[PDB]
Amino acid sequence: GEIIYDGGLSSKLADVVDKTTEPHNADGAVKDGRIAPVKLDLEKQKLDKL
């Protein structure tokens, strides 16, 4: 017989990144107008620039 329903394109609720991500603000449907998080070089084991 004629095929009425044979699978199809399936929507996914969420995607999951398999790579480690740097901290970030929202850049999707919600866009954050504030400055991106500031990355500071702290907790240095050996002395430098002092």
């Binding site: 740097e22 901290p23 603000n25 954050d32 107008g33 504030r34 400055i35 991106a36 998080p37 500031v38 990355k39 500071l40 070089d41 702290l42 907790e43 240095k44 084991q45």
Partner: protein, 51 residues
Amino acid sequence: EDMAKIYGAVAAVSKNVNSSVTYEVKRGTHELIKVPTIPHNLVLIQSDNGK
């Protein structure tokens, strides 16, 4: 045009707020070496006749 200039200047001030900071906590952490062999210090001394 003047109002567009004024509104844009105010928007820049509003965008100067700071979200957060990020840093790496590493002080006090050291690497570990692995010692392969146990340092025994024993030696056996025996006479030629075996006495």
